[PDB]
Amino acid sequence: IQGAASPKDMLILVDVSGSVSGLTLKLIRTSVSEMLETLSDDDFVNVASFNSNAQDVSCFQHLVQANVRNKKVLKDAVNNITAKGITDYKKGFSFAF
Amino acid sequence: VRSIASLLLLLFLFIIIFSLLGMQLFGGKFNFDEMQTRRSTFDNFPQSLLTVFQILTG
Amino acid sequence: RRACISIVEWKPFEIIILLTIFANCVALAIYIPFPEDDSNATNSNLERVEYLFLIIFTVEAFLKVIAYGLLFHPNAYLRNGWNLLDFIIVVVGLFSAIFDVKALRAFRVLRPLRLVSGVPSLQVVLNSIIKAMVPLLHIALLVLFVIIIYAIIGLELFMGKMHKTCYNQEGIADVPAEDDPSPCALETGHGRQCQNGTVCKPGWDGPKHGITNFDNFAFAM
């Protein structure tokens, strides 16, 4: 992943809204934590989420370098997420950008 | 045929009522964290009619 | 004042009210019940259309009830034709407010039934079906008695005997060992014994989610 690409600024927009309740949420929480494992130490990441209001799953509020540690905060905050409420792509992309 | 059609249409209305009520009670409530083996859910109307028919034939 | 309302039913609008019933059936078909309060645009529009349908039903309620009276209008198939609006009016009286409220929506599924009220060639066949149903209540009583007797016998015999399951003996994980657990019975009892590396010990697994066992009396029925 170092030779194959240049440093990134990832920003995962998990969709924790009502319609992902159930199995779709178990795959989102798994797949997010399976994507934070493709981040080096010289590329940043944050994990937002939106259910008619876009917030952060973690306590970071900006990009956080994806160290061995910063990832653990994000992985452990993604795993403790729950589906609820309507889905709003406008307010959740206006938070990512 | 005027009476076969009437009987079948009344049956169809019974199935429609017990499928609208099916969506009202069990709409989207079948999401269990187990693998999605619930093919016969009540989610939308065509998938509710198949489930009500499957119950009907038992 | 009552004369115009009375001559309204002379005009064949009953077709338009039946078309309102059909439009209500179609408005209910398109409504997708998303799992946890989620919704799309279509479900948002259908609520405004639903306020429209409550309006067009309450109006005809006034018209048909003033021209036939409080003691004669309900004295027909029309009872639910009012009942259905009454509670659904309450739905508005609660929907703007916000609980147990969303489930109250279920009443609106009885509106298709009002359709068989409109056309008589279906009312006659429905009455035929119900009239044929009436003689079977003796069979229904016999089946009720059979269920009662056999549930009581099951209670006498199968009284909570379906819980000891085949857990793993090594003891680290107390999840039942088998992929599809089946109620076992430890030694000194009959039935099935576990394999070479497990223990048939109590718990709660037995049957599926404890829904189909014989413990209680409402489980036995």
Next chain:
Amino acid sequence: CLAMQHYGQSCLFKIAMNILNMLFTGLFTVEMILKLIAFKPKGYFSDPWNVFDFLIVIGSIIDVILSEVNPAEHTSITFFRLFRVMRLVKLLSRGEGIRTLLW
């Protein structure tokens, strides 16, 4: 009283159930004695219904007798219990539509 028994049963609950069982089998045995008084056994065993009730009564009383042992402390055949429910079938005969249809 045959219907309330439920897995997860209180120790006092079983005792109350047994007291009620003794009371009810006693009333049915009193029925039996009174009916035998009303007409001698030569006039009793004509009706199959009374024979059926006699079997139910004797099974219940023998079960009460065998309850003397304590296989499970308040902390062995079960067959004669099943007579107690079976008496309910007699109640079914009250209706005449049911009686004629099944007959």
